Every structure is written in structure tokens, then in C-alpha cells.
Design a protein around this ligand. Structure first.
Ligand code: NAI
Ligand code: NA
Length: 404
């Protein structure tokens, strides 16, 4: 009778929210779109863009930036769960439904492919879509965050590890359920754990993608590809940059060589690793220390007027560096968009606060309030203008969605 609709509220445990709100996710996507259109157009951008990991976080922001900033037709790949009666879909599903809605309103092409981007099947479906619709693509954004990867050949399942390397580490953090500041000791990764992490979050699959598009002739001349990375403040180095996930990110710096080699022989193509700031996403919230680190960083950067989320960061990456006349390069040939997080004065303040925070001063020393708000926003909760009291049909459909 009324069974087709429901009132959807957050159900949160740690860094996991098992519900998502379709109306709220739509409004969140609209907010990011309106940011881009308010900042204004970006000149000399790609007009045909493939985003791998296009449904949430930085990849969603890249899709929105490319489409509503550069005016691009966009093809997205992601791995999300559709809604069904009584069972809300994932936020990325609802985000992507909204993206298709708003793109079509603006007369922009938007097609998506839902499935495992690590697989040959999904690469071929993507190839088929480009051939049918666009001819070629000018830019490929590589923005996957995953705990696992099934090798497309051997069928071996690799699982990522988020551990330090060498020595065990005493890592402080904020338990967001209990609101306590506490520490735990993380054991170092074994060689197998490191290899598995490089296999998942390293650059092999990115390479596989560019080669497959190349072989099929659906990569255009003067095209560009970038994969997102994080270097972070020195305080994050034990768990991130110099940890197992860092070994994977370091591999991007090496794969950006052979991939760039393949592309540069193809009409003068290129590849870069783009370094971005820490933001609240499904991925970051799951990394040890990150909820505490983000709570502090948010506070410090807000004090300086430099706080940004996904859309602000990616908009500036496109405008300043991917398409801009004065790009921000480092000594490694990485594109850097993260310098405001890495400023020595910011690092110093974050470090001082890191060593002062307790159960009783969390709200005086940090922006845990902001962290919590942004975390809920990911899932479509706490958004302006959304009536959370209203029943909603969780079964939200997407036109031009190819299910793998
Ligand atoms: N979150 C952060 O602070 C930062 C993240 N980055 C990097 O940006 C990239 C994206 O991260 P986030 O935006 O944080 O993650 P996210 O969790 O918001 O998004 C992950 C995306 O990958 C997709 N995905 C995951 N597995 C897939 C699969 N097997 N097949 C197809 N799609 C799949 C998801 O659908 C989603 O679109 C990552 O490389 C991450 O390391 C870089 C700087 C900092
Ligand atoms: Na992403």
C-alpha cells in the first residue's frame, strides 16, 4: 500500500553509513554543480571525458567540473548499488542519477557504466560506449578507491592493507562513535601485504586502461590522463605516504612513466599524477587517524580562509593545472593542488593541536562538528532545503546506465 516508499535516516557505525538519501544526494550534487557554474567556465578544457570512479568524492567532482565547468560530454565508470524497495542504494548511485538529470537539463551527454573497473569486460563496455557516442575521448580521469582488486587475468583477489612499513606505530585517532581520543598500535605490513596494496591502489590498472583505450583507437590526439594521489603533511607519513598505501601511490609516480610513454607516441599525449588535499570521503574516513586529522585540518584551514572540499579542489585543479596557463608543478613533474594543506604554518598548528586534544576539549580544539557534517553530507543527510520527514521512493532509476 505505502510499502513502495520510506523515510530514510542515517544509520552510522564508525566510518560506515548504511543508508543514503536520494533527495539529499541530488541536492548535494546540485550544490557542487552550482559552485562550478558560479565560479564560472574553464577555457580550453577537454570536450570528451572518461572518469573512472565517477560517482562520489573527487571523481564525482572531476565529472562535475569537466561537464559544468569545461562543457564536456562525460562517460563515467563506477561500482554502486541501485536502490530497491525498502533498501536505499549507495550514495554514488543517487549522486549519479542526479548527475544524469542535471546534465540532460543542460543538454550535455551523460552516460555511465556500473561495474568492476578492474575487469576487461568493463573496459570493453567502456570502449563500446566511446565508439558509439563520442568517437574518442580527450581526457581520462583515474579516481578509483578500493580495498580489493581481482586481477583480470589470474583471477587472483588482492586485498589492500593500511599499515605502516618497517616499525609498528602508535597512532592516535578519534573514535567517532564514542567520541574519545585514543591510540592503538598498528603492526607493519608484510611484503605480501605491501605487494597486494600496490596491486590494488598502484598504477597497473590505470596502465591497463590507457593501453586498452589506445589499442581500440578511442583515445584522441593531445589527450591527457591524470590519476589522483595524496602526499600529505608529515604527521600522516607513517600511516600514509611511507606506509603500504604510500607504496601504492609511489607506484603511480613510476607508472606515469610507461603510460606517458604509450601516450606520447600517440599524437603527443601525456600523463600526470595530481596531488590533492585531504578531504572527507568514503575512502578517507576509513583510513586510520584521518577523522582526527581532518577535524584538526578543517579548523586550522578555516581559520586561514583556505578550507576546501572536493569540488573546490578539483575545480582549481582543472582551472589552474589541467587546463590553465600557469600550472603548479613540483620537482617530480606532479601537478600539485595540495600546497595550502602543506604550508609549514598549517602543519605546525595541526601538530600542536594533535598533541593537546583530549576527550574533554574535542569541540574547543577541533572542527569535529564540521567533520561530522561533511561526513553526513556524503550520504545526502543534513542538506539545506531537503525535507527529511517526507517519504521517498528508494528505487531511483538512471537512463543510459550500462550495467556490467
Ligand atoms: N579522499 C581524500 O582525502 C583523497 C583522495 N585521493 C585519491 O583520490 C582518489 C579517489 O578517492 P576518493 O574520492 O577519496 O574515494 P571515493 O570513495 O569517494 O570514490 C571511489 C570511487 O571509486 C569507485 N570504485 C571503487 N571501486 C571500484 C571498482 N572496482 N570499479 C569501479 N569503480 C570503483 C567508486 O564507485 C567511487 O566512484 C583515490 O585515488 C584517492 O586515493 C587523493 C587525495 C586525498
Ligand atoms: Na572518486
Amino acid at each position: 500500500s505505502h510499502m513502495l516508499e520510506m523515510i530514510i535516516k542515517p544509520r552510522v557505525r564508525g566510518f560506515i553509513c548504511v543508508t543514503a538519501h536520494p533527495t539529499g544526494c541530488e541536492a548535494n550534487v546540485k550544490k557542487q554543480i552550482d559552485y562550478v557554474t558560479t565560479e564560472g567556465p574553464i577555457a580550453n578544457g577537454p570536450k570528451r571525458v572518461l572518469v573512472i570512479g565517477a560517482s562520489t568524492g573527487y571523481g564525482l567532482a572531476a565529472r562535475i567540473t569537466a561537464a559544468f565547468g569545461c562543457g564536456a560530454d562525460t562517460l563515467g565508470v563506477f561500482f554502486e548499488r541501485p536502490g530497491e524497495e525498502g533498501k536505499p542504494g549507495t550514495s554514488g548511485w543517487y549522486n549519479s542519477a542526479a548527475f544524469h538529470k542535471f546534465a540532460a537539463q543542460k543538454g550535455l551527454y551523460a552516460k555511465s557504466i556500473n561495474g568492476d573497473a578492474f575487469s576487461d569486460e568493463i573496459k570493453q563496455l567502456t570502449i563500446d560506449a566511446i565508439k558509439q557516442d563520442l568517437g574518442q575521448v580527450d581526457q581520462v580521469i583515474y579516481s578509483l578507491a578500493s580495498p580489493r582488486r581481482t586481477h583480470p587475468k589470474t583471477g587472483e583477489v588482492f586485498n589492500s592493507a593500511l599499515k605502516p612499513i618497517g616499525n609498528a606505530v602508535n597512532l592516535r585517532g578519534l573514535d567517532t562513535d564514542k567520541e574519545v581520543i585514543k591510540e592503538s598500535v598498528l603492526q607493519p605490513a608484510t611484503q605480501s601485504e605491501i605487494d597486494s596494496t600496490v596491486a590494488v591502489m598502484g598504477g597497473e590498472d590505470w596502465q591497463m586502461w590507457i593501453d586498452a583505450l589506445l589499442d581500440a583507437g578511442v583515445l584522441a590526439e593531445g589527450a591527457q590522463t591524470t590519476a589522483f594521489t595524496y602526499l600529505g603533511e608529515k604527521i600522516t607519513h607513517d600511516i600514509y605516504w611511507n606506509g603500504s598505501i604510500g607504496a601504492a601511490k609511489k607506484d603511480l609516480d613510476q607508472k606515469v612513466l610507461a603510460i606517458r610513454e604509450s601516450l606520447a607516441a600517440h599524437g603527443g599525449g601525456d600523463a600526470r599524477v595530481s596531488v590533492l588535499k585531504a578531504v572527507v570521503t568514503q575512502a578517507s574516513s576509513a583510513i586510520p587517524m584521518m577523522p582526527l586529522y581532518l577535524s584538526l585540518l578543517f579548523k586550522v584551514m578555516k581559520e586561514k580562509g583556505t578550507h576546501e572540499g572536493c569540488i573546490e579542489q578539483v575545480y582549481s585543479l582543472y582551472k589552474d593545472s589541467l587546463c590553465g596557463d600557469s600550472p603548479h608543478m613540483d620537482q617530480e613533474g606532479r601537478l600539485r593542488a595540495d600546497y595550502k594543506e602543506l604550508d609549514p604554518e598549517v602543519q605546525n598548528q595541526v601538530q600542536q593541536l594533535w598533541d593537546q586534544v583530549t576527550n574533554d576539549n574535542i569541540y574547543q580544539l577541533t572542527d569535529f562538528v564540521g567533520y561530522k557534517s561533511e561526513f553526513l553530507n556524503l550520504f545526502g543527510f543534513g542538506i539545506d532545503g531537503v525535507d527529511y520527514d517526507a517519504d521517498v521512493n528508494p528505487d531511483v532509476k538512471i537512463p543510459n546506465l550500462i550495467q556490467g
